[PDB]
Design a binder for this molecule. Structure first.
Ligand SMILES: Nc1ncnc2c1ncn2[C@H]1C[C@H](O)[C@@H](COP(=O)(O)NP(=O)(O)OP(=O)(O)O)O1
Ligand SMILES: [Mg+2]
Ligand SMILES: [Mg+2]
Length: 430
DNA sequence: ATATGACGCT
DNA sequence: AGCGTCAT
């Protein structure tokens, strides 16, 4: 009873940039600001594949994955910006550099774990402690929280959204024990105040807006972040979890969006995260394994222990390209040439990495996909990465995959290759 | 015919 | 080591 931990030990935030590639293009080109807008790669097939969408465009039903020509049928005024193309492939440098701007600002507040090109987790537990002693039991003003939502509030005994926001925040603050420095809810509130500040600094210094989740672990933080996007932050407290989870589809929780999530639904005959509570940990372990069962048992009670790993930099650097359908590489010369293109971008990125971050990759991984295999990768092999030299790197990769070629003729390659992928890995200090 | 990155399993 | 899962 007093021995049951509640997963309330930490304050953890997840910050995610609003329509990130779109914002990067909109900052560069004022003409695209406050417009239905999308970022697109490869204008040649159906106008390009959409990979990011402004919220004005979303309101017309434009989504990621969609072809640009089809997006124009839903939204004829849609403005587009194209991904840089270098060496015959998509080049994401602009967005990687924009990402670094954001991560450096967040780094100033606390230790971040970079989770994607546009998001990081933040462990606020220490910052909240320090901010709490400087505050000295002084009540927290709703003015310190001008973009914050308290999930599940307002409740009990207004028409438009900002009215509802404030009402819920007033209820939350009015209930707040500012007397006890170790109250979990109080810790979350102070965490929210800091994330208000962090998000203001990001906007001020970059022009980019973002949303945030503030809770006790990574999973709740990521879930909370999405609940009030764009340009808003959401606090999910321990106590909000039962109602929140009671109608929350299983697939919405991080790691349960694929096969395992589907098997939980299937095997257990449930739909919502909260329904998991009626199962014993041993029952869950028997159906899904020791670690999965353990993790589900605690998670459906809002408890999770994945720590925020102190890592602002990626652990691999990679370049890939699909060669779909009729463009699938079918000769030795095409394979070699495209491996050189990939190796050339890779080298440019590794040398920049070695100078910026005082480390060097030591292993090269080569990955291909062949026509008809619908796996991401058909095959992976590796070799030593000794020199940041594109010509050597591509030669080495060709060497380690050449024998996949099932062809009779010298100059032909079969089966045709639908993807090439070079990944530098196993970094070491230098 | 939609470019990446992290991590688990064996 | 090489493959399978899940993610943006
Ligand atoms: N399948 C994919 N292929 C290529 N790039 C992608 C991608 N998914 C995302 N990106 C790139 C482009 C994206 O801009 C960026 C961040 O991805 P999100 O945070 O999942 N989506 P956004 O930040 O745009 O919208 P909001 O967060 O407001 O919902 O990563
Ligand atoms: Mg985002
Ligand atoms: Mg994101």
């Amino acid at each position: 009873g007093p021995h049951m931990a509640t997963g309330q030990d930490r304050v953890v935030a997840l910050v995610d940039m609003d329509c990130f590639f779109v914002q990067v293009e909109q900052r560069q080109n004022p003409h695209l600001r406050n417009k239905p807008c999308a970022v697109v790669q490869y204008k040649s097939w159906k106008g390009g594949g959409i990979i990011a969408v402004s919220y004005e465009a979303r309101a017309f039903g434009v989504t990621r994955s969609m072809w640009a020509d089809d997006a124009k049928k839903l939204c004829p005024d849609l403005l587009l910006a194209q991904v840089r193309e270098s060496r015959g492939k998509a080049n994401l440098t602009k967005y990687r550099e924009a990402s670094v701007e954001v991560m450096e600002i967040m780094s100033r507040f606390a230790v971040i774990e970079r989770a994607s090109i546009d998001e990081a987790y933040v462990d606020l537990t220490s910052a909240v402690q320090e901010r709490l002693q400087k505050l000295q039991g002084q009540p927290i003003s709703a003015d310190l929280l001008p973009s914050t939502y308290i999930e599940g509030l307002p409740q009990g005994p207004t028409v438009q959204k900002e009215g509802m926001r404030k009402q819920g925040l007033f209820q939350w603050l009015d209930s707040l024990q500012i007397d006890n420095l170790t109250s979990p809810d109080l810790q979350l509130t102070v965490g929210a105040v800091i994330v208000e500040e962090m998000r203001a600094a990001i906007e001020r210094e970059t022009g980019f807006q973002c949303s945030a989740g503030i809770s006790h672990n990574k999973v709740l933080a990521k879930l909370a972040c999405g609940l009030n996007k764009p340009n808003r932050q959401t606090l999910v407290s321990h106590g909000s979890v039962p109602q929140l989870f009671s109608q929350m589809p299983i697939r919405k929780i991080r790691s349960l969006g694929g096969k395992l999530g589907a098997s939980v639904i299937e095997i257990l005959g449930i739909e919502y995260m909260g329904e998991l509570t009626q199962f014993t940990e041993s029952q869950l372990q028997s159906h899904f394994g020791e670690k999965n069962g353990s993790w589900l048992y605690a998670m459906c009670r809002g408890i999770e222990h994945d720590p925020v790993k102190p890592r602002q930099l990626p652990k691999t650097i990679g370049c890939s390209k699909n060669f779909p359908g009729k463009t699938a590489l079918a000769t030795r010369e095409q394979v070699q040439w495209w491996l050189l293109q990939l190796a050339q971008e890779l080298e440019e990125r590794l040398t920049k990495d070695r100078n910026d971050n005082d480390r060097v990759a030591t292993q090269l991984v080569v990955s291909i996909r062949v026509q008809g295999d619908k796996r991401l990768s058909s095959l992976r092999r590796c070799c030593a990465l000794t020199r940041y030299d594109a010509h050597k790197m591509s030669h080495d990769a060709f060497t380690v995959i050449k024998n996949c070629n099932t062809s009779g003729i010298q100059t032909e390659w079969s089966p045709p290759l639908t993807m090439l992928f070079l990944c530098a890995t196993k970094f070491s200090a230098s």
